[PDB]
Amino acid sequence: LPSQVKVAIVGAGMSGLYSAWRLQQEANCQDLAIFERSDRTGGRLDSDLIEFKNLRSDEPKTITVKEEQGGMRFLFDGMDDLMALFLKLNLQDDIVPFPMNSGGNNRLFFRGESFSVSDAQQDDYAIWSHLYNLDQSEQGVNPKDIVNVVFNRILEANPQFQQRPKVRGPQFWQDFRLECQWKGQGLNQWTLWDLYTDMGYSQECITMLYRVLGFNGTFLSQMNAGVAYQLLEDFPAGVKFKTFKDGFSTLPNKLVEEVGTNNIHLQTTIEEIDFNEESGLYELSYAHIDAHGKIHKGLVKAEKVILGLPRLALEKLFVRSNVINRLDQDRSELLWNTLQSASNQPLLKINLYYDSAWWGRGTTGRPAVEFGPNFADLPTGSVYPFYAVNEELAAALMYEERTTHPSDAVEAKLERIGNDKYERPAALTIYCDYLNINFWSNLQNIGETYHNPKQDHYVENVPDDIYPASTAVVEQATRFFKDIFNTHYVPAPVLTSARIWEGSVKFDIPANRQFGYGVHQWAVGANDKEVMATLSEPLPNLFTCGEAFSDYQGWVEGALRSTDLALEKGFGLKPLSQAYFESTHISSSDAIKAVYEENSSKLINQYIET
Amino acid sequence: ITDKQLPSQVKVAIVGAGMSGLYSAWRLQQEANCQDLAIFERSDRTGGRLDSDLIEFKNLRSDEPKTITVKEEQGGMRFLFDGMDDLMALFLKLNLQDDIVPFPMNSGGNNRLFFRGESFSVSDAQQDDYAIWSHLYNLDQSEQGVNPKDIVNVVFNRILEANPQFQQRPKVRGPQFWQDFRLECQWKGQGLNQWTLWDLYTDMGYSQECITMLYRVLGFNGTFLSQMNAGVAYQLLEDFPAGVKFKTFKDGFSTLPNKLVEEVGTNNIHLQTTIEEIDFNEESGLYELSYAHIDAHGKIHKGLVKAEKVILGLPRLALEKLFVRSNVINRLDQDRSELLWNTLQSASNQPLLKINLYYDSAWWGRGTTGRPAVEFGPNFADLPTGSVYPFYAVNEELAAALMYEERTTHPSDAVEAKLERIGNDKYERPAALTIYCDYLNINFWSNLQNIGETYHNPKQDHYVENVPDDIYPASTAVVEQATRFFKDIFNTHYVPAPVLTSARIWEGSVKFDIPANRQFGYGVHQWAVGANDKEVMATLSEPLPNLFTCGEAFSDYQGWVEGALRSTDLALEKGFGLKPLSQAYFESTHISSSDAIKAVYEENSSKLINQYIETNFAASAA
């Protein structure tokens, strides 16, 4: 319960932990503290470890499902800050594949018709002509290949944009959206809806576009077209995403240990930020619920202030705080408009757990649904299968990342392992954005809290950070699963969770029962070179960082890079990828690929081949 | 004529020169003798969300009339003689009754529909038991062979049958009914205010293909996808009874607030005066209103007005801005201020927009298309246009024709010919198309508006005699796509460029320094999921002692001027002891305002029909 600190960090998200960690390590500022709003660290990183009772055997005592309510995946290219963080933190031996497809057998459900990725391919993509009244010119082409055709049109309209990096990372995309024009106007002045239309595409075609992709905010929200293509063309050809074995929460979990649980104060809401004139310290007025559930209002002084906060928290602090008025109005207006520049993008994940996976060939008569998104123009948006932690399955996925062409024997081993996973506990995730949020988030307040009566027959221990879905959600989830997997058989989940990442301004819903917005993306007209400059140090010795106003939004790496900019401006710390390269003479990506290649080889030799 | 010089102290400080704040002052003056009030309005115009366009075209086919006028509306439009008794009384007590004219809603089936890539008529969609919707949507068997719109009727009946304890069945389903409906009827154990329509239909088993069909054919998709509760959603939808006979004003809806200014006195209304924060001084006992004024030469004066009573005829977002910026939201029970803040969040902000394309003549008539002409009423599409309304130049003979058609009956031979001729005539005068849409389509137009050059027909002065200044034209991009959609909706390749356009986006910003007056409130408000509006209305009628709130935003009858009226009637009852206007009217006349206005309108339409259509025995002429 400190009273003064050299450096006050607000938010135990990734932005605030990474800050604490870089200051303690590389600048030896051992007079800091993180004040966190809720009763938990990690922010929009919430992973779930649920353990089931083995009902079919006895050799495994319990089995364990790893489910993600927030972040799930990362990549070895384009995220050199995150790979550096992983490596310096020694989390690299826990990285496993996050496969994204089932060789064509993932489901698609559109305009009342359920079918597969291989199916939609048939007959020169003919089915899309049947579900949508497309122009002749939009017939006979993979829908998702239209996104590449538009991208290539933009490039051919912008000869001055000669940037063609092997990896199209944040820098590239910032340059793309601020320097590239359509019809004389930079892409940050356009939406995809207006762009595609202007280009001559039919509205049937556009609707087909923002349905197949699962997320529609790229077309129907206020985000601009240039940042839209950062999120689309983040999926090149053979993308091999990765995750952590025990869930993404291992990252902030490990950052907690290295920072010290005694330097982090949960359930402490910083309420206003004043600046003391004579003393020269920032004064941060807080509100802290003790271990006995009773409120204290108090104050903490600071020489330097680090807000690892998303847009809506910042605005709440702007409105409430006393320093806004202690400021030039034109400047204060600038700040506000600066805060209005990245759109809030609500997301939700709903997780349904089963005693075993019913979407396999054995129980549907259709080609097994394995991994990756099952896309539908229902309110589900995307649906992702998640399976129980199994070291042998992880190793088979590692063999298949370089699938190449296995021998007949490996193909048999692979079929066996893929089959085994359907007999262990598993779970499905509904994951959607923008237009579908309202469907699920009010349906969540309809009905009772869902409780499988035989839930103790199945699960040994459920954690506390699990807020179940309503009976209404489980009914409609089940009705949409029947449609998507084209099956009569969808049993009741043994266990459910709901998470609506949509910011609120309403008092007295339980503080840890509601959560900030999912992600943020640069709005129309925002110039983010300018806004990031302003937000790194909007006030002397007050800094801001996080995913919200980053150049890699929607991803931890954005929070990382954005915090690197506040540490550079404030404490002269070189970017983390860059400090790593100069001490090792190998980029964090080349190192992580080397180390993972070794680990994967060790697992492939122990469970699959040689 | 309005000018500027500001008072230091007043008994009653009215914030806002919208319908609500103008109405406040008028009732206070007439019915309370409160001649110590002032109206401080944010912008350079009275009326609020009520913005009529008067546009003089050159008459090029004659010299007989020098100019021809197209009354277009960027804001308020239309009203009903039933269910709107405060507005009917207001009309009468202000002597506006002789201006009312019909507001037609159909072309006898010739209106267009454009869905899932196909263009067709209202008559087409009815053929073969509504077959076409089964071809455009992958509907379940039990949602086939029915008018899409009747599914809304059937669900309405089903909610009642499921609520036998709700026995209210009035001849006019008014604000009181719908409030009781949304707060007393339940579905699966939960009040309708706990439901969205999206969730509700999906629970009742409708396919998503059906629900999509529904929210596109209704023209407005906010009743399903926004956060307004299923209860108030039905108030909007079943506000259209059997024979829909809407009324509007001859010269446009600006008639109303303009007349109110003349009666309250322009010297009491200070334009370009934004109230910024409200404190409460305890020793003097008066509210303190920090304002900012732009004088006639674009120069700012900062000052204070005191008041014993304060009246906020402001929508949600304006109230929120005052709340955040104000001092009397501190020094209260934090539980109190939090209750007020949450209370302010209970009405969803619903954006709306209108984009008006004007033509020297109506190219969508029989003679320039070779097909059955489109006449009046919305043309519906799942394109981003939403609804498309044709509007015609003011013509008193045309209004007499419509006053006759209203009472459809059975015209003689000679009358049927005159009506046909009058309807052909409206296509040979200047006319306008109006794109009108909400929620999900807002982002299409509002961002497209920021694309391209400002639209300007170079030969516009050949056609237009006087354009106002509160006309902000549409981007060239907006004109291009607007044309693209018209080509589809109207099933032709012949959509000429307009001579003039205007765009009006009723969507709030929280940004400082938006173009100019571009700061426009949200379009309407509808009660959100979970909102008990009975309680909210009580709270907001006097959230602070001697500080009152009113307007459409948190009203009985959202979306409508009548809502602003009934809400203000509640603040005036609460603070100055004034019975509702429709009730005070009734007690002074012993006839309801709706009965009284119906009578008057009957006589006036009699006079006009005798002047232009039929002298009762033989047809008239001109």
Ligand SMILES: Cc1cc2nc3c(=O)[nH]c(=O)nc-3n(C[C@H](O)[C@H](O)[C@H](O)COP(=O)(O)OP(=O)(O)OC[C@H]3O[C@@H](n4cnc5c(N)ncnc54)[C@H](O)[C@@H]3O)c2cc1C
């Ligand atoms: C559904 C979803 C899926 C995602 N998937 C991925 C993925 O696959 N890969 C990926 O790389 N990224 C993913 N992300 C992004 C990732 O979750 C975030 O970008 C990252 O955690 C950003 O952290 P941050 O510190 O910037 O913000 P946050 O983690 O949101 O941290 C903000 C913190 O500040 C606290 N706070 C706010 N106001 C106050 C206050 N006044 N006082 C005290 N504390 C306060 C909050 O409680 C919170 O702990 C996903 C996000 C979501 C929502």
Ligand SMILES: Cc1cc2nc3c(=O)[nH]c(=O)nc-3n(C[C@H](O)[C@H](O)[C@H](O)COP(=O)(O)OP(=O)(O)OC[C@H]3O[C@@H](n4cnc5c(N)ncnc54)[C@H](O)[C@@H]3O)c2cc1C
């Ligand atoms: C497109 C559209 C069509 C409509 N059509 C119809 C129709 O056909 N029939 C019908 O009955 N209704 C219709 N309406 C509804 C009608 O516009 C409103 O219901 C009604 O005008 C509500 O007025 P009000 O006084 O409550 O608020 P407003 O009209 O919004 O007035 C508020 C005023 O307060 C001022 N103000 C705001 N903040 C401040 C501040 N801080 N200080 C000082 N002044 C401030 C604003 O400048 C504004 O003039 C329509 C609305 C729209 C958007």
Ligand SMILES: [Cl-]
């Ligand atoms: Cl089991």
Ligand SMILES: [Cl-]
């Ligand atoms: Cl696939």
Ligand SMILES: [Cl-]
């Ligand atoms: Cl094309």
Ligand SMILES: [Cl-]
């Ligand atoms: Cl019609």
Ligand SMILES: [Cl-]
């Ligand atoms: Cl659709």
Ligand SMILES: [Cl-]
């Ligand atoms: Cl066309």
Ligand SMILES: [Cl-]
């Ligand atoms: Cl056409």
Ligand SMILES: [Pt+2]
């Ligand atoms: Pt079809």
